Amino acid sequence: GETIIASTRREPLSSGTVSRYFMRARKASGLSFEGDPPTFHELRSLSARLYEKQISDKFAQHLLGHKSDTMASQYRDDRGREWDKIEIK
DNA sequence: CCGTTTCGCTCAAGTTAGTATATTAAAGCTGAACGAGAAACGTAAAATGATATAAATATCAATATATTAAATTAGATTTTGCATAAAAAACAGACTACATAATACTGTAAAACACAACATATGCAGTCACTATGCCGAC
Predict the structure, then answer these.
(1) Would you tell me which residues have their CB within 7 A of strand B?
(2) CB neighbours of A51 closer than 8 A, spacing ≥ 6?
């Protein structure tokens, strides 16, 4: 299609539908979280979380389009999901 | 071919993610009104093109010889650029003399208002009428 992410009709797809079809597989996958379950937007958080350990921190700060140095530590939090494993370093 | 149900869409109310400015200071942009000198135009007048023919005047080569305007000097001199310096007049730097304001001090009338006993119109105090439909009563 004309867009990198099109539909089954070779036509663009709204942003308020790409996440909808993502929630279905979420509940169908049979998961279990604390409080409000994740979402499609969380893919941006997981991407940066991996881009911080794979390469560096200065890399997962420009790719996301961020410039400030206040949310670089807030978008790195875990909120109480997986314990921040502290290695020898 | 047509009807029925699911699915792609957008409206409506909650749930999150991101970035952070106000005054000074000094311009810069652009619509609209303001104020002369030179040349292209144009009608009118002056000079010239038009036009031709026998007779009058100029066209010109090739060289001797007297004549002359005038650039080319070459020396003479007013003209022109530039100060130098003193006689002569302007003008601060002094100073007493002279008429004039700010001030020193005496001399005198009178403005400006409290104080006090009366005098009394006038606003305030107290009651009834003027002027005309309410309220209450019938229709």
Answers:
(1) A 7-9, 11, 13-14, 16-17, 36, 41, 44, 64-68, 70-71, 74-75
(2) A59, A60, A63
Measured in angstroms, the resolution is 11.0
Q: How was this structure determined?
A: cryo-EM
Estimate in Å the CA A2 to C1' B89 gap, whole number.
105
Instruction: From the CA of A88 to the C1' of B14: give the distance in Å.
Output: 44
Q: Residues, chain A, total?
A: 89
In order of A28, A69, A72, the CA distances from A59 in angstroms are: 34, 13, 11
Residues of A labelled catalytic = 41, 44, 66, 75
